[PDB]
């Protein structure tokens, strides 16, 4: 191999020459700023300077080149990267950095800024990044922007930059089958408002934008509104659209295929190769669709589903390369369509079984057997979904183990064996709450409306303690009627605007039975909503978690397994 | 910060590509008509002369066609390619010219690399040549190393052709030094004479200087008559100046005369509990116990060998892994004056307790757990003391453990439980020899004269073998106290066969005593009993070998009687 | 018409002939020392060949088949099986010669 010591010595000597200006022969003249540099470094880094000097043109012998349509700071950072290899990339100058990298065809920095932008893609810059990837040919960025823009924009459709988009880009966006919309009318009104941004600059594109939307809205309202905005005496558009909507037979999209499903993690892996897998139950389809394995079989993790219906994974441990397990603070995000886990910004401290709770767009991970264990062994930390970073919050006053947390009334409610503390995001403080009369642990709670339903606790039992936020008191309702001499595995969840329970029971010398019940809020009784047949759902285990979310049956595949 | 990953590698790759395509070049070197287009930046960062060549405001600074002379084309090309890729890839022949060109161009990194390569390759013959080379181009490390190697070997050769052509200052430094490895004072005198006979009437003043340097002890023997035979005519004051070198200038004894025949021991009972084993020495005549520094200071289970030129080598061994005994194939050599260990070319297989045998100037390592389970476990590997390399030879006939090997009549002999094979260095093959009637292992043999004396085994078995007769016979039993397990050690002492044995009983202390054995008497006469007041316990895995050492360089081992 | 008993505990090559009714040695297969050659002898395209794998300490297994000649008593290098297509087999694996259909069978997916 090439001697790295001599390579770094040569590089540092060249950078010293650059700083001291000894062997510089070519100077870059940009907006009156002198940039003394060499030809060898520029040729090695950029693919434009190699064609600027070794070409035989008038600049081959000229020692002063007036490089135009560039920026001084961008050129300076590119030169210093070419001379030392350090590329300091902030969150603002990456746009002009990519512009100048495409202006010098510097694939070295082009790849670096492409990776930075593939990491930086978020909701508030999705349309801007897609427009940037349309301006400069970049297929990876274009595809990532396609996916993220489709999802987040069809969720939001309010960005100001969406109005200033090319016709081809909008045709690609609207005609795609990856849009995430609960209805087919929101895309219609989004297209209408985009068209009405201008009057005559969009008339020619009117015949094309309607060609990608289904005819179910091409004969109903929002056709006379276009006639109102039609240019005067234009008889080539009204009669055109009058007899035009014959083709494009109505085909349902993919965004209207989200159903309230119970996502399960760390289930009993059918194949012994994996230790744990992930499955999902369909309360409506009455089937069990398989889910992608956790990233690097990440066990002992926590789940959260934001009000925007997004799944996240935090904490967990990976078997170190017989008992062998090491805890990692890696963070991941689940793609609802690609059926894969996209990595995100990792946490600061590793966790085991963390309680992920979403509130005000922030992901809160409370506790989880942190590595530190100092006097603040109860330190909790939130995540920024806008800036893609983690921020510490007010620590929990008391150290708790095997706890659960929910969000009610824009506040974090973490529950332990007998104590409860409410966190105020506005003031970053903890307030003492009501005290339970029973010592129970290893249970889960579901936030339904303005009440907290702590179900089960210790196997578990059928004890239920209902807490009211407005009343600040713990009261008993009833006990779930289950078979005696059994060990039910209770799982509290909210589904169909009602509090249902996923309770798996096992009898003596008998296999586990799956059945869910609907708890009557006013009657204080668990009614049999549906019985899960064992012909579709097999054993899941004991350390499995359940959460409420929506998934697409089309993108996912049915798990092939014998009843 | 110097980021050595992606950017660094890509940049150096593209720089090599440009050197190859002749791109962005602005300076070309003319070397006896050969053109070497290159860049000023690389020459400035690599060579400390090209930076002044292009930065100093003179004529060659801007001159594109520079005619650099007194430099070889191949050496400049290899220097340029090293500057452009970082790899030197130096051979063993063009080292001198490469070093000369590096010194002329003042390229520090390649200068250091060549200095290390030269200091590692003072084997047997280029010692005086590279010493003169280092005298011409000042190099303190090379000068000192070559001086020590010369003081070690030229004192035994003193006939090298290159030694004749030496500057006066270097010769004065060599001769006046007290590191001459000569057991006699006339050899240096005749060496100086022959250095002053081939070049006479040209270095007459230097002749007088060397005459004074060799001093009275050798000045009063023959030098006057030889000079009278060889003096130029009409020389009178030269007689006056030569007659003056009889009384003065501090006649003192030399150092090479102290080549006392002693015994080198390894893996002794360490005094400080922090250390496990130690290497010590014993003086048969001075009746003193000297110590030696451990070669690795942590690795044990080594094998010893002594060449006819009284050299000590260490090969193989095992060292603890020090996790929070691994075998290493390293090699070492003992310095007779610096009391240190200079490593040499390592072996190819990690052996455990190798048996090294010297023959025809080559070191032969026979057996010793080459590394472990092997397709052909019965295998050997020899060493070249001149070329400094390991050459594979014909393997062993049979696989043996705890074997011993000696050299007799310039032939390799290896002894095992009951079999013996003679290896022919000329034909590189093994010939079957006589088989012992007794099956004994864990013993060693000594090559005294023309007879091999296999002593011990499990005892006191004395089986004498003769090469000319090819037969095994018994002589007698060594007188040892009963209810004991003697540890026999057979080795040559002062051209007389002797043994070094230690007896151990129950609830009794070990006793060390050496006996004098006679060939026709078959009896071990009491030669000397080693007193415990000077020598302490050694152990069980200790080894013994015969060699000459310097008392002044070594240090006495402190121990309470 | 000759039986080739290869290996045993090694690289023992003992050739037997029905007509000659005798056991003889030919040569030793060129195998790196400090290795355990899993020899496998089988007929290939009406030509005697072998399939052997060598294993050392802290080293990866290598698969390579050699072409052996009757009168030369030497295993000429016929083809070295690249590890990019074939992975490790094991110790108790068996080898036999037969004709198969590629379309009916399926390729084994494995990362090079």
Contacting residues for C100 by C-beta, under 8 A, at least 6 apart: none
Helix, strand, coil fractions of chain A, as percent rounded to 5: 25, 25, 50
Contacting residues for C16 by C-beta, under 8 A, at least 6 apart: C2, C3, C4, C5, C22, C23, C24
Enumerate residues preceding breaks in chain B (C to N > 2.5 Å): 324, 458
Q: Which two tokens stand for residue C52?
A: 């052997």
Q: How was this structure determined?
A: cryo-EM
Whether residues B10 and A108 touch (CB distance < 8 A) is answered with yes
Calculate the CA dihedral of residues B162, B164, B165, B167 and round it to 10 degrees: 120
User: B514, B545, B538, B542: which is closest to B528 by C-alpha?
Assistant: B514
Q: Which two tokens stand for residue B13?
A: 């790759």
Gap between the Cα atoms of A210 and B58, Å rounded: 77
Contact flag for A and C (3+ C-beta pairs < 8 Å): no
Answer positive or negative: Cα dihedral of B455, B457, B461, B464: negative
Chain center to CA of B31: 41
Sheet holding A545-551, edge to edge: A288-290, A276-281, A259-268, A545-551
Q: How far is CA B472 from CA B357, B438, B449, in A?
A: 22, 10, 16
Tell me if A456 sits within 8 A of A462, measured CB to CB: yes
Task: Describe the crossing of helices A139-156 and A107-120 by its angle, rounded to 10 degrees.
Answer: 20
Gap between the Cα atoms of A457 and A441, Å rounded: 5
Chain center to CA of A534: 34
Calculate the CA dihedral of residues A506, A510, A513, A517 and round it to 10 degrees: -50
Q: Using the CB atoms, write b or e for A455-480: b if 16+ within 10 Å.
A: bbbeebbbbbbbbebeeeebeeeeeb
Contacting residues for A124 by C-beta, under 8 A, at least 6 apart: A159, A386
Helix, strand, coil fractions of chain B, as percent rounded to 5: 25, 25, 45
Q: How far is CA B438 from CA A556, B367, B457, B467, in A?
A: 81, 22, 9, 19
Contacts B372 to C, Cβ<8 Å:
34, 57
Q: How far is B381 from chain C (nearest CA, A)?
A: 14
Whether residues B54 and A14 touch (CB distance < 8 A) is answered with no
Residues 86-145 of A with CB under 8 A from B: 86, 108
Chain B touching partners, 3 or more CB pairs below 8 A:
A, C
Burial (CB count <10 Å: 0-12, 13-18, 19+), residue A444: buried
Strands A26-30 and A64-66, by their bridges, are parallel
Gap between the Cα atoms of B498 and B490, Å rounded: 6
Whether residues B376 and C35 touch (CB distance < 8 A) is answered with no
End-to-end CA distance of chain A: 58
For B386, other C-beta atoms within 10 Å of its C-beta total 10
Residue A363 main-chain phi, psi, to 5 deg: -95, 120
Scanning every residue of chain C, which has its alpha carbon at the shortest distance from the alpha carbon of B376?
C33
Whether residues A4 and B4 touch (CB distance < 8 A) is answered with yes
Contacts B12 to A, Cβ<8 Å:
2, 7, 10
HEC assignment per residue over B234-303:
CCCHHHHHHHCCCCCCCCCCCCCCCCEEEEEEEEEECCCCCCCEEEEEECCCCCCEEEECCCCCCCECCE
Q: Which two tokens stand for residue A256?
A: 């209207």
Residue from A40, A56, A61 to probe the interface with B (highest B Cβ count within 10 Å)? A40
Gap between the Cα atoms of B487 and B278, Å rounded: 19
Residue from C12, C34, C35 to probe the interface with B (highest B Cβ count within 10 Å)? C34
Whether residues A45 and B87 touch (CB distance < 8 A) is answered with no
Residue A466: strand pairing partners: A453, A475
Task: Describe the crossing of helices B108-119 and B95-105 by its angle, rounded to 10 degrees.
Answer: 150
Domains detected in chain A:
4-135 (3.30.710.10), 259-558 (2.120.10.80)
Gap between the Cα atoms of A462 and A503, Å rounded: 10
User: A336, A292, A333, A296: which is closest to A314 by C-alpha?
Assistant: A333
Q: Is A505 helix (H, G, I), strand (E, B) or coil?
A: strand
Whether residues B375 and C57 touch (CB distance < 8 A) is answered with no
HEC assignment per residue over B175-236:
HHCCCCCCCCCHHHHHHHHHHHHCCCCCCHHHHHHHHHHHCHHHHCCCHHHHHHHHCCCCCC
What does the DSSP 8-state code read for residue A162? G
Tell me if B283 sits within 8 A of B260, measured CB to CB: yes
Gap between the Cα atoms of A345 and A22, Å rounded: 44
Q: Which two tokens stand for residue A422?
A: 């409410």
Count of alpha carbons within 13 angstroms of residue B163, beta-carbon side: 23
- Whether the CB of B371 is below 8 Å from some CB of chain C: the reply is yes
Number of B–C residue contacts, CB under 8 Å: 15
Sheet holding A311-314, edge to edge: A302-305, A311-314, A331-334, A341-343
**Max CA pair span of chain C:** 49
Tell me if A24 sits within 8 A of A36, measured CB to CB: yes
Gap between the Cα atoms of A407 and A413, Å rounded: 6
Contact flag for B and A (3+ C-beta pairs < 8 Å): yes
Q: At which residue do the structure tokens 């066969």 appear? A: B497
Whether residues B14 and A44 touch (CB distance < 8 A) is answered with yes
Whether residues B372 and C11 touch (CB distance < 8 A) is answered with no
Strands B462-466 and B471-474, by their bridges, are antiparallel
Tell me if A353 sits within 8 A of A315, measured CB to CB: yes
Whether residues C33 and B379 touch (CB distance < 8 A) is answered with yes
Q: Which two tokens stand for residue B27?
A: 């300076």
CA angle in degrees (0–180, nearest 5) for B525-B263-B278 = 125
Gap between the Cα atoms of A36 and A83, Å rounded: 12
For C111, other C-beta atoms within 10 Å of its C-beta total 5
Sheet holding A512-520, edge to edge: A492-495, A498-506, A512-520, A525-531
Q: Is A240 helix (H, G, I), strand (E, B) or coil?
A: helix
Calculate the CA dihedral of residues A547, A551, A557, A559 and round it to 10 degrees: 20
What does the DSSP 8-state code read for residue A558? B
Sheet holding B65-67, edge to edge: B34-38, B27-31, B65-67
Contacting residues for B327 by C-beta, under 8 A, at least 6 apart: B316, B317, B318, B350, B351, B352, B369, B371
Resolution of this entry in Å? 8.0
Scanning every residue of chain B, which has its alpha carbon at the shortest distance from the alpha carbon of C10?
B375
Gap between the Cα atoms of A94 and A80, Å rounded: 16
- Whether the CB of B399 is below 8 Å from some CB of chain C: the reply is no
User: B473, B463, B521, B530: which is closest to B496 by C-alpha?
Assistant: B521
CA angle in degrees (0–180, nearest 5) for B146-B148-B152 = 115
Contacting residues for A80 by C-beta, under 8 A, at least 6 apart: A86
Calculate the CA dihedral of residues B332, B335, B341, B344 and round it to 10 degrees: -30
């Amino acid at each position: 191999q090439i001697n790295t010591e001599y390579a770094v010595s040569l590089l540092e000597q060249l950078k010293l020459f650059y700083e001291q200006q000894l062997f510089t022969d070519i100077v870059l003249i940009v907006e009156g700023t002198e940039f003394p540099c060499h030809k060898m470094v520029l040729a090695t880094c950029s693919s434009y300077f190699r064609a600027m000097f070794m070409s035989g043109l008038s600049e081959s012998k000229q020692t002063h080149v007036h490089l135009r349509n560039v920026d001084a700071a961008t050129l300076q950072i590119i030169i210093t990267y070419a001379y030392t290899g350090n590329l300091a990339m902030n969150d603002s100058t990456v746009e002009q950095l990519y512009e100048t990298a495409c202006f010098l065809q510097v694939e070295d920095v082009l790849q670096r800024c492409r990776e930075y932008l593939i990491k930086k893609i978020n909701a508030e810059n999705c349309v801007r990044l897609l427009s940037f990837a349309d301006l400069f040919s970049c297929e990876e960025l274009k595809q990532s922007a396609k996916r993220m823009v489709e999802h987040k924009f069809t969720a939001v459709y309010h960005q100001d930059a969406f109005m200033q988009l090319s016709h081809d880009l909008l045709i690609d966006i609207l005609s795609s089958d990856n849009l995430n919309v609960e209805k087919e009318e929101t895309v219609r009104e989004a297209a209408m408002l985009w068209l009405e941004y201008n009057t005559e600059s969009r008339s020619q594109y009117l015949s094309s934008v309607l060609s990608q939307i289904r005819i179910d809205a091409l004969s109903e309202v929002t056709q006379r509104a276009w006639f109102q905005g039609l240019p005067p005496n234009d008889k080539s558009v009204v009669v055109q659209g009058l007899y035009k909507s014959m083709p494009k037979f109505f085909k349902p999209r993919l965004g209207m295929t989200k159903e309230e499903m119970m996502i399960f993690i760390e289930a009993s892996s059918e194949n012994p190769c994996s230790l744990y897998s992930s499955v999902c139950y369909s309360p409506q389809a009455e089937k069990v669709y398989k889910l992608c394995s956790p990233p690097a079989d990440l066990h002992k993790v926590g789940t959260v589903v934001t009000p925007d219906n997004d799944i996240y994974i935090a904490g967990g441990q990976v078997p170190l390369k017989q008992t062998a397990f090491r805890t990692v603070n890696c963070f991941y995000w689940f793609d609802a369509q690609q059926n894969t886990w996209f990595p995100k910004t990792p946490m600061l401290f590793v966790r085991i079984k963390p309680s992920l709770v979403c509130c005000e767009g922030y992901i809160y991970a409370i506790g989880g057997d942190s590595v530190g264990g100092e006097l603040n062994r109860r330190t909790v930390e939130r995540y920024d979904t806008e800036k893609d970073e983690w921020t510490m919050v007010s620590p929990l006053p008391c150290a708790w183990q095997w706890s659960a947390a929910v969000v009610v009334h824009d506040c974090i409610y973490v529950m332990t064996l007998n104590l409860m503390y409410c966190y105020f995001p506005r003031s970053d403080s903890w307030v003492e709450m009501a005290m339970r009369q029973t010592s129970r642990s290893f249970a889960s709670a579901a936030a339904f409306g303005d009440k907290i339903f702590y179900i089960g606790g210790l196997g578990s039992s059928v004890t239920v303690e209902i807490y009211d936020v407005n009343k600040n008191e713990w009261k008993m309702a009833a006990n779930i009627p289950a078979k005696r001499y059994s060990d039910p595995c209770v799982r509290a969840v909210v589904i169909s605007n009602s509090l249902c329970v996923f309770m798996r029971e096992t009898h003596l010398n008998e296999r586990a039975k799956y059945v869910t019940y609907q708890y009557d809020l006013e009657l204080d009784r668990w009614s049999l909503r549906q019985h899960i047949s064992e012909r579709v759902l097999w054993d899941l285990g004991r350390d499995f978690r359940c959460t409420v979310g929506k998934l697409y049956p089309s993108c996912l595949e049915e798990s092939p397994w014998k009843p």
